[PDB]
Amino acid sequence: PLESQYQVGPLLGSGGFGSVYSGIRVSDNLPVAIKHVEKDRISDWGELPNGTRVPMEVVLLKKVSSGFSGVIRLLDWFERPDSFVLILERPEPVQDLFDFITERGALQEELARSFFWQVLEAVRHCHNCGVLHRDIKDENILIDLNRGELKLIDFGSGALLKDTVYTDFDGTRVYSPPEWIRYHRYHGRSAAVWSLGILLYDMVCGDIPFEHDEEIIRGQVFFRQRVSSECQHLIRWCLALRPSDRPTFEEIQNHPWMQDVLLPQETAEIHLHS
Numbered sequence: 169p170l171e172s173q174y175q176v177g178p179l180l181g182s183g184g185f186g187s188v189y190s191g192i193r194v195s196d197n198l199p200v201a202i203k204h205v206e207k208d209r210i211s212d213w214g215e216l217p218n219g220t221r222v223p224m225e226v227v228l229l230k231k232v233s234s235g236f237s238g239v240i241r242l243l244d245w246f247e248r249p250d251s252f253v254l255i256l257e258r259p260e261p262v263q264d265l266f267d268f269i270t271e272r273g274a275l276q277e278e279l280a281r282s283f284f285w286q287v288l289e290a291v292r293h294c295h296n297c298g299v300l301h302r303d304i305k306d307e308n309i310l311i312d313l314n315r316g317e318l319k320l321i322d323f324g325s326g327a328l329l330k331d332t333v334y335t336d337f338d339g340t341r342v343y344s345p346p347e348w349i350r351y352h353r354y355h356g357r358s359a360a361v362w363s364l365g366i367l368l369y370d371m372v373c374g375d376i377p378f379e380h381d382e383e384i385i386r387g388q389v390f391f392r393q394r395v396s397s398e399c400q401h402l403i404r405w406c407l408a409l410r411p412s413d414r415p416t417f418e419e420i421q422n423h424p425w426m427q428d429v430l431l432p433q434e435t436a437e438i439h440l441h442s
């Protein structure tokens with residue numbers, strides 16, 4: 169028992185998501201990421217089947233961590249007097265999509281297609297497990313550079329999926345939908361599809377389409393890079409001002425732009441010089 173079943177290594181990063189360190193599980197040398205979150209900085213709390221008070225992030229991760237891929241899995245967690253420590257898997261080598269885009273600029277549509285498809289599969293898995301991420305963006309997507317597999321991270325702004333309206337939100341504003349900005353109300357799926365629209369534009373144009381509230385509310389999409397008509401159409405559809413005018417995940421994946429996706433390994437061999 170006790171939290172010394174892990175050897176601590178360098179700090180990988182730190183921000184609103186806590187402090188994350190590279191580590192190793194001593195029992196079988198497996199790579200892991202160790203996230204530390206201070207209790208005072210956690211606003212949303214839930215409870216596990218057994219009735220213990222834990223961060224919502226732990227509740228959500230447990231719900232999506234059974235089975236396989238698309239989402240980084242929570243392997244274990246610990247409670248300290250002033251923090252919680254989450255043990256997560258550590259693919260390697262890795263780079264998040266924000267950093268990848270910063271370095272390489274706008275992505276070729278074939279690569280954007282493989283990436284976007286994998287994000288859609290991951291988000292669907294979350295929703296099927298009753299989990300809404302609420303902070304889908306490039307920064308929260310890790311790329312396993314060797315396998316070409318994308319993994320969703322940072323469920324610290326998430327919530328249990330529900331069919332009623334959400335009146336609370338603490339994700340990233342520039343990825344938030346017009347109905348949140350104007351009325352402080354949104355439904356889970358349609359808000360998620362809006363964020364996926366921002367993400368897709370971000371991939372093919374190298375930057376997000378909106379910076380100011382006024383731009384989000386207006387919903388006018390200007391393309392700064394050459395992007396195919398089918399891709400523009402999908403983006404504009406995801407970014408419909410009326411939530412009910414947005415596509416379902418099924419409609420997104422049946423869209424003409426999404427056909428003939430590359431498999432993850434092919435994606436890495438062609439685009440991740442792997």
Ligand SMILES: O=c1c(O)c(-c2cc(O)c(O)c(O)c2)oc2cc(O)cc(O)c12
Pocket residue numbers: 180181185188200201203240256257258259260261262310321322
């Ligand atoms: O699971 C995670 C993870 O593996 C990594 C990671 C892995 C690497 O191999 C790196 O080189 C690196 O910088 C980060 O970061 C994270 C950051 C989070 O906020 C949350 C996570 O769950 C992870």
